[PDB]
């Protein structure tokens, strides 16, 4: 059962943040109400671990968490509803009012990784894979299915909204990533399909397999 999500950020480690489309309206409303409240209560003592508001590069305020105070000019924040990080001065920080807390609406961005694929260890190969995914899915609406948990973030399959093509499988087909085998019996059909695409990618001498195997 695939659910619609909006992909916000792709990380250099081939993880990615998504927002649930079903709650997009609620996020929009919260932001509208938060900003109306900020406009009347113009910007707090930033400290590590604390929630705040932070003024992004579009000139708008968003919900954030303080991760590191490097100096008064360099406060490291994480935008809880989008997943991007930013270093900013104190002039771009404010109090997050209780009316807009994560109890009122949960953090809207969730970190995921692709199921059944290995993130390339070679730096340039990993860049090629990241770059593909950025071009194809960053800031677009996709379909998502949670496959399995891990000692880390959950792993998922994504589908393109239009073609319904499996995104991670696309990477394997292109020879941009290798397959990550799992033992669960319910994953055997999909893993066999991924291994089949990988072998075909190897025979076509694409990307990772350009010079053979």
């Amino acid at each position: 059962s695939y659910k619609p999500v909006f992909v916000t950020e792709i990380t250099d480690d081939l993880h990615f943040y998504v927002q649930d489309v079903e709650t997009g309206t609620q996020l929009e409303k919260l932001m509208e109400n938060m900003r109306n409240d900020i406009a009347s209560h113009p910007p707090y003592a930033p400290r590590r671990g604390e929630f705040c508001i932070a003024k992004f590069v579009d000139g708008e305020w968003y919900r954030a968490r303080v991760e590191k105070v490097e100096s008064p000019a360099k406060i490291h924040v994480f935008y809880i509803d989008y997943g991007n990080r930013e270093v900013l001065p104190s002039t771009r920080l404010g109090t997050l009012s209780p009316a807009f807390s994560t109890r009122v609406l949960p953090a809207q961005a969730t970190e995921y990784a692709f199921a059944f694929i290995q993130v390339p260890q070679d730096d340039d190969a990993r860049t090629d894979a990241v770059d593909s995914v950025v071009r194809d899915i960053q800031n677009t609406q996709c379909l998502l299915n949670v496959e399995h948990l891990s000692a880390g973030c959950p792993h998922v399959t994504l589908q393109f909204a239009d073609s319904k093509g499996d995104v991670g499988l696309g990477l394997v087909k292109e020879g941009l990533v290798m397959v990550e085998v799992r033992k669960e019996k319910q994953f055997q059909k999909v893993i066999t399909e991924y291994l089949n695409a990988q072998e075909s990618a190897k025979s076509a001498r694409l990307n990772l397999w350009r010079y053979g195997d």
Partner: peptide, 6 residues
Amino acid sequence: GRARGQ
């Protein structure tokens, strides 16, 4: 506007 102008 989901891309935030980006």
